[PDB]
Design a binder for this molecule. Structure first.
Ligand SMILES: NC(=[NH2+])NCCC[C@H](N)C(=O)O
Ligand SMILES: O=C(O)CNC(=O)C(=O)O
Ligand SMILES: [Fe+3]
Length: 338
């Protein structure tokens, strides 16, 4: 399937044109599971600078890369083969950028799970990634206003959840395939409101569109992980690399809040004949936000930070971050926040 591309206005005000655009965005997700947004010169420049920083960092020796880790936050380095999806190793190397909180921050002092300072490789890499993430966040907020408008909801419905949102980014390098291994990342869904992603010209992202009659697991429930689901089953859409766009698809929270009117798009990565750089950005609720059903009055909620924490613990069962959460009973804070 050949994807739709939209140009977003710099500001979303709720004018009648914004409602029509929002309607189109929703309908593109309901048809294809994904759409593209055009990038302007600055958005593209910041994307390329981040990609270049990623390539330069990956050239560092492994001993140095592996030192960029923290027992407070999941930010930092993930070696190729380290992450687990559905019990199988994923092959990118990754640098994850979560909210960059100093040890003087009150949430860090209180010992909240996943809160702490990014173990940056250096200040030059830091600046490239922070500038990119700030730009990505402006796009996320436009998209959330448009999504609310397309559902004829109050314009701030989703952005009210993203104040000091737990936005984060996975800066990825996928190695080349071998004749017997081509799994980059197993099939999965991501966890928050939106996923905005950039990729180089190599290719390897596949997404699953909505399928009439197909039951979808609710990955915010422990008994219904979406990891590995549909891995070997049609249909999978190849997201062809296209110059001058970012891709956008929903995460688990949007699926929950919309009652399945939007689905959290399953996706996976195949290793190609060349190494592949990509960046995946997650526009998320505040860690303390409680997502709720928009169209139902049911009692179910998703505590976003609980979902993030549960997911990252399953991704990284042996990481020092996970060990410290378990040792210090940091999950108790979530019970308290709830
Ligand atoms: N941290 C991530 N977004 N990881 C994406 C891959 C899927 C992840 N390993 C999982 O089990 O859910
Ligand atoms: O590499 C890509 O284009 C897709 N990346 C992801 O889905 C991810 O890391 O969660
Ligand atoms: Fe993903």
């Amino acid at each position: 399937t050949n994807l739709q591309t939209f140009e977003l206005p710099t500001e979303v005000t709720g004018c009648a044109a914004d409602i029509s655009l929002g309607r189109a965005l929703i309908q593109a997700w309901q048809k294809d599971g994904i759409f593209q947004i055009k990038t302007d010169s600055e958005q593209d420049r910041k994307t390329q600078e981040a990609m270049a920083a990623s390539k330069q960092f990956c050239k560092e020796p492994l001993t140095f890369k592996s030192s960029c880790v923290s027992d407070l936050t999941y930010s930092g380095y993930v070696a190729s083969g380290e992450e687990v999806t559905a019990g199988k190793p994923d092959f990118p190397e990754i640098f994850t950028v979560c909210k960059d909180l100093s040890v003087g921050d009150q949430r860090v002092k209180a010992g909240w799970p996943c809160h702490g300072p990014v173990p940056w490789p250096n200040n030059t890499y830091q600046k490239s990634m922070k500038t990119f993430m700030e730009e990505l966040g402006l796009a996320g907020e436009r998209l959330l206003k448009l999504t609310a408008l397309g559902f004829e909801l109050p314009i701030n419905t989703f952005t009210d959840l993203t104040r000091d949102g737990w936005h984060h980014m996975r800066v990825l390098r996928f190695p080349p395939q071998t004749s017997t291994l081509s799994r980059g990342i197993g099939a999965h869904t991501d966890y928050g409101l939106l996923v905005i992603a950039a990729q180089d010209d190599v290719g390897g992202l596949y997404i699953r569109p909505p399928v009439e009659g197909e039951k979808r697991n609710r990955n915010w429930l422990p008994g219904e992980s979406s990891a590995g689901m549909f891995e070997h089953d049609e249909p999978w859409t190849f997201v062809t690399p296209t110059p001058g766009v970012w891709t956008v698809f929903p995460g688990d929270i949007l699926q929950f809040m919309t009652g399945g009117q939007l689905l959290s798009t399953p996706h996976k990565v195949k290793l190609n004949t060349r190494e592949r750089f990509a960046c995946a950005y997650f526009h998320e609720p505040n860690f303390e936000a409680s997502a709720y059903p928009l169209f139902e009055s049911a009692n179910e909620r998703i505590h976003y930070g609980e979902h993030f924490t549960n997911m990252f613990m399953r991704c990284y069962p042996d990481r020092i971050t996970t060990q410290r959460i378990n040792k210090e009973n940091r999950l108790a804070h979530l019970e308290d926040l709830k």
